[PDB]
Specification:
Entry title: The Crystal Structure of PTS System IIA Component from Enterococcus faecalis V583
Assembly: dimeric
Shape of chain A: globular
Keywords: alpha-beta structure, Structural Genomics, PSI, Protein Structure Initiative, Midwest Center for Structural Genomics, mcsg, unknown function
Helix content of chain A: 10-25%
Number of strands of chain A: 8
CATH architecture of chain A: Beta Barrel
Strand order of the largest sheet of chain A: 1-3-2-6-7-5-4-8
Number of helices of chain A: 2
Strand content of chain A: 35-45%
PDB class: structural genomics, unknown function
Oligomer: homodimer
Distance between the termini of chain A: 9 Å
Chains A, B: PTS system, IIA component
CATH topology of chain A: M1 Pyruvate Kinase, Domain 3
Protein backbone atom coordinates (compact mmCIF):
# COMPACT_ATOMS: atom_id res chain seq x y z
CA UNK A 1 0.00 0.00 0.00
CA UNK A 2 1.17 3.49 -0.87
CA UNK A 3 0.60 6.75 1.04
CA UNK A 4 0.90 10.35 -0.23
CA UNK A 5 2.47 13.35 1.53
CA UNK A 6 0.09 16.31 1.53
CA UNK A 7 1.71 18.60 4.09
CA UNK A 8 5.08 19.09 5.76
CA UNK A 9 5.46 21.03 9.01
CA UNK A 10 8.25 23.60 9.28
CA UNK A 11 9.80 21.68 12.18
CA UNK A 12 9.09 18.28 10.67
CA UNK A 13 12.35 17.55 8.88
CA UNK A 14 15.75 18.30 10.37
CA UNK A 15 18.67 16.00 9.62
CA UNK A 16 20.32 16.46 13.04
CA UNK A 17 17.07 14.97 14.37
CA UNK A 18 17.27 11.58 12.67
CA UNK A 19 13.50 11.30 13.24
CA UNK A 20 10.39 12.17 11.22
CA UNK A 21 6.90 12.06 12.68
CA UNK A 22 4.07 10.94 10.43
CA UNK A 23 0.50 12.08 11.05
CA UNK A 24 -2.83 12.01 9.27
CA UNK A 25 -4.61 15.26 8.43
CA UNK A 26 -6.96 15.39 11.41
CA UNK A 27 -4.10 15.67 13.91
CA UNK A 28 -4.23 19.03 15.74
CA UNK A 29 -2.59 21.94 13.85
CA UNK A 30 0.01 22.51 16.59
CA UNK A 31 1.22 18.95 16.25
CA UNK A 32 1.33 18.92 12.43
CA UNK A 33 4.01 21.62 12.49
CA UNK A 34 6.32 18.89 13.81
CA UNK A 35 5.40 16.26 11.23
CA UNK A 36 5.00 15.14 7.66
CA UNK A 37 1.34 14.65 6.76
CA UNK A 38 0.30 11.57 4.85
CA UNK A 39 -2.85 10.40 3.09
CA UNK A 40 -2.70 6.62 3.45
CA UNK A 41 -5.93 5.06 2.02
CA UNK A 42 -5.07 1.37 2.54
CA UNK A 43 -3.70 2.06 6.01
CA UNK A 44 -5.84 -0.54 7.72
CA UNK A 45 -4.14 -3.24 5.65
CA UNK A 46 -0.57 -2.66 6.89
CA UNK A 47 1.36 -4.79 9.35
CA UNK A 48 5.00 -3.76 9.61
CA UNK A 49 7.67 -6.15 10.84
CA UNK A 50 11.48 -6.17 10.92
CA UNK A 51 12.73 -7.00 7.42
CA UNK A 52 10.01 -5.11 5.57
CA UNK A 53 10.75 -2.00 3.52
CA UNK A 54 9.54 1.58 3.24
CA UNK A 55 10.22 3.47 0.02
CA UNK A 56 9.96 7.18 0.83
CA UNK A 57 10.15 9.06 -2.41
CA UNK A 58 13.30 7.74 -4.09
CA UNK A 59 15.08 6.07 -1.17
CA UNK A 60 14.41 2.49 -0.09
CA UNK A 61 14.76 1.81 3.65
CA UNK A 62 14.78 -1.46 5.60
CA UNK A 63 12.81 -1.73 8.88
CA UNK A 64 15.15 -3.06 11.56
CA UNK A 65 12.83 -2.74 14.56
CA UNK A 66 9.21 -1.89 15.35
CA UNK A 67 7.83 -0.51 18.62
CA UNK A 68 4.84 -2.38 20.08
CA UNK A 69 2.46 0.44 19.00
CA UNK A 70 3.78 1.11 15.48
CA UNK A 71 1.32 -1.24 13.73
CA UNK A 72 -1.70 -0.17 15.80
CA UNK A 73 -1.02 3.56 15.43
CA UNK A 74 -0.33 3.37 11.71
CA UNK A 75 -3.25 1.09 10.77
CA UNK A 76 -5.76 3.11 12.74
CA UNK A 77 -4.92 6.75 12.17
CA UNK A 78 -1.74 6.79 10.00
CA UNK A 79 0.45 8.05 12.86
CA UNK A 80 3.99 6.79 13.41
CA UNK A 81 7.56 7.81 14.19
CA UNK A 82 10.24 7.03 11.56
CA UNK A 83 13.66 6.71 13.19
CA UNK A 84 16.70 6.76 10.88
CA UNK A 85 19.06 5.13 13.38
CA UNK A 86 19.62 1.84 15.17
CA UNK A 87 17.11 0.70 17.78
CA UNK A 88 18.25 1.32 21.33
CA UNK A 89 19.89 -1.69 23.01
CA UNK A 90 17.74 -1.16 26.11
CA UNK A 91 14.21 -2.30 25.23
CA UNK A 92 12.63 0.28 27.55
CA UNK A 93 14.08 3.10 25.47
CA UNK A 94 12.43 1.82 22.26
CA UNK A 95 9.96 4.38 20.89
CA UNK A 96 6.48 2.87 21.23
CA UNK A 97 5.25 3.61 17.71
CA UNK A 98 8.75 3.71 16.34
CA UNK A 99 9.69 2.23 13.00
CA UNK A 100 13.50 2.11 12.98
CA UNK A 101 15.07 2.34 9.52
CA UNK A 102 18.32 1.80 7.60
CA UNK A 103 20.12 3.39 5.77
CA UNK A 104 20.20 6.48 7.99
CA UNK A 105 20.30 8.97 5.12
CA UNK A 106 17.34 11.30 5.58
CA UNK A 107 14.60 11.06 2.93
CA UNK A 108 13.80 13.74 0.35
CA UNK A 109 10.19 14.73 0.92
CA UNK A 110 8.04 17.41 -0.70
CA UNK A 111 4.26 17.72 -1.12
CA UNK A 112 3.24 14.81 -3.33
CA UNK A 113 6.04 12.51 -2.19
CA UNK A 114 4.92 8.89 -1.95
CA UNK A 115 5.58 6.41 0.86
CA UNK A 116 5.34 2.78 -0.21
CA UNK A 117 4.74 0.40 2.69
CA UNK A 118 6.27 -2.72 1.11
CA UNK A 119 5.47 -5.47 3.62
CA UNK B 1 -21.26 4.98 30.88
CA UNK B 2 -18.25 6.51 32.67
CA UNK B 3 -14.77 5.72 31.37
CA UNK B 4 -11.92 7.26 33.32
CA UNK B 5 -8.57 8.49 32.07
CA UNK B 6 -5.71 9.86 34.19
CA UNK B 7 -3.20 12.61 33.39
CA UNK B 8 0.40 11.36 33.48
CA UNK B 9 2.22 14.41 32.10
CA UNK B 10 1.55 18.01 31.11
CA UNK B 11 3.77 19.61 28.48
CA UNK B 12 5.23 23.06 29.14
CA UNK B 13 3.18 24.44 26.24
CA UNK B 14 0.09 22.33 26.87
CA UNK B 15 -2.07 24.81 28.79
CA UNK B 16 -2.50 28.54 28.12
CA UNK B 17 -5.64 30.35 29.31
CA UNK B 18 -5.34 32.80 26.38
CA UNK B 19 -6.17 30.05 23.85
CA UNK B 20 -9.27 28.19 25.09
CA UNK B 21 -7.95 24.89 23.82
CA UNK B 22 -6.25 21.80 25.29
CA UNK B 23 -4.72 19.01 23.20
CA UNK B 24 -4.98 15.52 24.72
CA UNK B 25 -2.77 12.66 23.60
CA UNK B 26 -2.12 9.11 24.72
CA UNK B 27 1.03 7.29 25.78
CA UNK B 28 2.45 6.83 22.26
CA UNK B 29 3.38 10.50 22.02
CA UNK B 30 7.04 11.39 21.56
CA UNK B 31 8.80 14.30 23.29
CA UNK B 32 8.35 16.82 20.45
CA UNK B 33 4.59 16.32 20.71
CA UNK B 34 4.45 16.10 24.51
CA UNK B 35 5.46 19.72 24.98
CA UNK B 36 2.09 20.63 23.41
CA UNK B 37 -0.26 18.29 25.19
CA UNK B 38 -1.81 16.83 28.30
CA UNK B 39 -0.87 13.13 28.21
CA UNK B 40 -3.57 10.72 29.34
CA UNK B 41 -3.70 7.02 30.29
CA UNK B 42 -7.13 6.11 28.89
CA UNK B 43 -7.49 2.32 29.41
CA UNK B 44 -10.85 2.12 27.62
CA UNK B 45 -10.29 4.54 24.75
CA UNK B 46 -11.24 1.77 22.33
CA UNK B 47 -14.79 2.04 23.73
CA UNK B 48 -15.30 5.84 23.62
CA UNK B 49 -17.95 7.41 21.39
CA UNK B 50 -18.83 10.99 22.27
CA UNK B 51 -21.83 12.91 21.01
CA UNK B 52 -23.48 16.24 21.80
CA UNK B 53 -25.11 16.20 25.22
CA UNK B 54 -22.48 13.89 26.67
CA UNK B 55 -20.17 15.26 29.37
CA UNK B 56 -16.54 15.39 30.34
CA UNK B 57 -15.71 15.81 33.98
CA UNK B 58 -12.20 17.25 34.08
CA UNK B 59 -10.87 17.47 37.61
CA UNK B 60 -13.24 19.63 39.66
CA UNK B 61 -15.26 20.83 36.64
CA UNK B 62 -18.04 19.19 34.61
CA UNK B 63 -18.45 20.12 30.92
CA UNK B 64 -21.19 19.37 28.41
CA UNK B 65 -20.16 18.50 24.82
CA UNK B 66 -21.67 20.99 22.33
CA UNK B 67 -20.03 19.63 19.17
CA UNK B 68 -17.82 16.70 18.16
CA UNK B 69 -15.61 16.74 15.06
CA UNK B 70 -16.08 13.86 12.60
CA UNK B 71 -12.69 12.40 13.62
CA UNK B 72 -12.66 13.04 17.37
CA UNK B 73 -13.91 9.57 18.28
CA UNK B 74 -11.46 7.74 15.99
CA UNK B 75 -8.56 9.90 17.18
CA UNK B 76 -9.55 9.14 20.77
CA UNK B 77 -10.01 5.42 20.14
CA UNK B 78 -6.63 5.12 18.40
CA UNK B 79 -4.18 7.44 20.17
CA UNK B 80 -6.38 9.08 22.82
CA UNK B 81 -5.79 12.27 20.84
CA UNK B 82 -8.27 15.16 20.77
CA UNK B 83 -8.56 18.92 20.73
CA UNK B 84 -10.63 20.02 23.73
CA UNK B 85 -12.11 23.35 22.66
CA UNK B 86 -13.54 25.67 25.31
CA UNK B 87 -15.45 27.93 22.92
CA UNK B 88 -18.54 27.75 20.73
CA UNK B 89 -18.12 25.64 17.60
CA UNK B 90 -17.89 27.59 14.35
CA UNK B 91 -21.15 28.00 12.44
CA UNK B 92 -19.28 26.95 9.33
CA UNK B 93 -18.83 23.16 9.34
CA UNK B 94 -15.82 23.28 7.07
CA UNK B 95 -14.24 25.21 9.94
CA UNK B 96 -15.01 22.67 12.66
CA UNK B 97 -11.84 21.03 14.00
CA UNK B 98 -12.00 17.39 12.87
CA UNK B 99 -10.64 15.92 16.09
CA UNK B 100 -12.21 18.60 18.27
CA UNK B 101 -14.59 18.27 21.18
CA UNK B 102 -16.35 21.53 21.97
CA UNK B 103 -17.12 22.15 25.63
CA UNK B 104 -19.07 24.50 27.89
CA UNK B 105 -18.58 26.27 30.25
CA UNK B 106 -15.70 27.97 28.43
CA UNK B 107 -13.57 28.13 31.60
CA UNK B 108 -10.36 26.07 31.39
CA UNK B 109 -10.18 23.12 33.79
CA UNK B 110 -7.58 22.83 36.52
CA UNK B 111 -5.24 20.05 35.38
CA UNK B 112 -2.28 18.46 37.19
CA UNK B 113 -0.55 15.08 37.25
CA UNK B 114 -3.13 12.68 38.63
CA UNK B 115 -6.18 14.60 37.39
CA UNK B 116 -8.92 12.33 36.04
CA UNK B 117 -11.03 12.91 32.94
CA UNK B 118 -14.38 11.14 33.12
CA UNK B 119 -15.98 10.52 29.74
CA UNK B 120 -19.73 10.29 30.50
CA UNK B 121 -21.49 8.99 27.40
Amino acid sequence: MQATVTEIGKHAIDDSEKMIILFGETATDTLKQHAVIQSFPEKDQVTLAEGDHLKIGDTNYTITKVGSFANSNLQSIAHSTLIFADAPTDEDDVIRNGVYLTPHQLPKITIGTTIDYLV
